[PDB]
């Protein structure tokens, strides 16, 4: 809260930013309180549960004890782990910027002093207390507004859309008939070659290489044109073969 309140002093719209973060802390307290208050409190159920004795073994409990002890140790003693570890992390993240280094040190050594963020935490505590006791009253409204916006719905339907669109694409363009694929290949050939010719200007048509035409090739060309025409318009297949 100290970092967020001193960040709204550079832009006006950033005044929106801490109070939103403030209600986040409200929400935080709620589930955490609800966690403990619906895990260990209440009453015991001797009909659905399994064991008559629920004493856990100690070896399972070793590592949570060590983690909770480290929690309590950096709780009551915050100075030595800060000065050992946390300061060169800040000098690493903010490289090339520390022309002095004593202000960071005297802020690490700072722990107490009356801050305006203290009553902010007190208000967090009081509002979470008055919000948790009435939680079975605004329960249905919260359930329906939580149903009102999620993000697994969008992702699941996006994958259904993607697989169905790809499958319908390959059901459209891959029919299996060889005539259609020949049409695609021939059309692509024609389009690429005609666009490549039309993009240029095709200068220098020189007819000087051309040979003198003679009568025998003319008559034989008319003959094989006749054979070509009678092999494309033939009704029977023997006519096309011959």
Partner 1 sequence: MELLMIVVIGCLFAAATYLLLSKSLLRIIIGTGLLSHGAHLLLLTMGGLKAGAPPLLGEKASRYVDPLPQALILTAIVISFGVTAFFLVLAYRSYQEIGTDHMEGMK
Partner 2 sequence: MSNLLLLPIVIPLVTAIVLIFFPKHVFWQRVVSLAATVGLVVASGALLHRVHTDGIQTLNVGNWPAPFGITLVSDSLSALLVLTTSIIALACLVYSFYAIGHKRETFYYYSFFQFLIVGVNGAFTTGDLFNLFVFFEVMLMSSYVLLVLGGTKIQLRETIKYTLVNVISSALFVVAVAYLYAVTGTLNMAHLADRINALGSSPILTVIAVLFIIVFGLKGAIFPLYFWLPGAYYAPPTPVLALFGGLLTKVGVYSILRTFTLLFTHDAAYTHTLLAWLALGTIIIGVIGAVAYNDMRYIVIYNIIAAVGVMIFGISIMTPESVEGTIFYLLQDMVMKAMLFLFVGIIFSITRSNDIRSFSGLITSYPLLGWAFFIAALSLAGIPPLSGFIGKLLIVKASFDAQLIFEAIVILLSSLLVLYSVMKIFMNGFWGEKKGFEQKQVDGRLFPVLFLLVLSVAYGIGIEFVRPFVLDAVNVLVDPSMYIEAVLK
Partner 3 sequence: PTLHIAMFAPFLLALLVPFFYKCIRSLHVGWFVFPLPIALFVYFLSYIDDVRNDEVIRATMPWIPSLRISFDAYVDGLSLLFALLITGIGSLVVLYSIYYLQKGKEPLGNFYVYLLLFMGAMLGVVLSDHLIALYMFWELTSISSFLLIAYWFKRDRSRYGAQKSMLITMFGGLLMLGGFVALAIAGGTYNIRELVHTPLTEHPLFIPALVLILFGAFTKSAQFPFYIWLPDAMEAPTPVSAYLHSATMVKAGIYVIARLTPIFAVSSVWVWTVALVGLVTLCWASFLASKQTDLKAILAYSTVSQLGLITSLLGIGGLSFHYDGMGENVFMVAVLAAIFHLFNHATFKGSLFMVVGIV
Ligand X SMILES: CCCCCCCCCCCCCCCCCCCC(=O)O[C@H](COC(=O)CCCCCCCCCCCCCC)COP(=O)(O)OCCN
Site membership for ligand X, residue 63 (CB under 6 A): no
Site membership for partner 2, residue 206 (CB under 8 A): no
Q: Which residues of 119-146 are buried (b: 16+ CB within 10 A; e: fewer)?
A: ebeeebeebbeeeeeeeeeeeeeeeeee
Site membership for partner 1, residue 181 (CB under 8 A): no
The answer to whether the beta carbons of residues 20 and 8 sit under 8 Å apart is no
Residue in 15, 192, 220, 226 binding partner 2, rule: CB under 8 A: 192
Site membership for ligand X, residue 19 (CB under 6 A): no
Site membership for partner 2, residue 181 (CB under 8 A): yes
Residue in 57, 113, 116, 176 binding partner 3, rule: CB under 8 A: 57
The CA distance from 119 to 116, in Å, is: 6
Residue in 48, 56, 85, 211 binding ligand X, rule: CB under 6 A: 85
Site membership for partner 3, residue 62 (CB under 8 A): yes
Token digits for 92? 């690493």
Q: DSSP states of 218-242 as a string?
A: HHHHHHHHHHHHHHHS-SSHHHHH-
Residue in 4, 5, 10, 101 binding ligand X, rule: CB under 6 A: 10
The CA distance from 95 to 10, in Å, is: 23
Residues that bind ligand X (CB under 6 A): 10-11, 13, 80-81, 84-85, 215-216, 218-220, 222-223, 225-227, 229-230, 233-236, 238-239, 242
């Amino acid at each position: 809260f100290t970092a967020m309140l001193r960040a709204k002093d550079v832009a006006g719209w950033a005044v929106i930013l801490p109070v939103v973060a403030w209600v986040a802390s409200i929400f935080t307290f709620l589930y955490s309180a609800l966690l403990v208050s619906r895990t260990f409190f209440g009453t015991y159920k001797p009909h659905v549960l399994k064991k008559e004795a629920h004493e856990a073994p100690f070896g399972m409990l070793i590592a949570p004890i060590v983690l909770a002890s480290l929690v309590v140790f950096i709780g009551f003693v915050p100075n030595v782990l800060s000065d050992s570890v946390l300061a060169p992390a800040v000098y690493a993240v903010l490289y090339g910027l520390f022309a002095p280094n004593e202000a960071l040190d005297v802020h690490i050594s700072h722990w107490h002093g009356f801050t305006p963020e203290l009553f902010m935490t007190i208000g967090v505590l009081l509002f979470g207390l008055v919000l948790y006791r009435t939680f079975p009253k605004w329960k249905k409204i919260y359930y329906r507004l939580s149903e009102r916006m999620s993000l697994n719905f969008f992702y699941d339907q996006s994958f259904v859309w993607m697989e169905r669109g790809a499958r319908s694409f390959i059901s459209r363009v891959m029919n299996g008939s060889m005539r259609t694929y020949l049409m695609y290949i021939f059309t692509s050939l024609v389009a690429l070659l005609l666009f490549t010719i039309g993009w240029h200007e095709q200068w220098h048509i020189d007819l000087s290489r051309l040979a003198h035409v003679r009568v025998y090739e003319v008559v034989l060309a008319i003959g094989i044109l006749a054979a070509t025409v009678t092999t494309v318009i033939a009704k029977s297949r023997l006519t096309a073969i011959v």
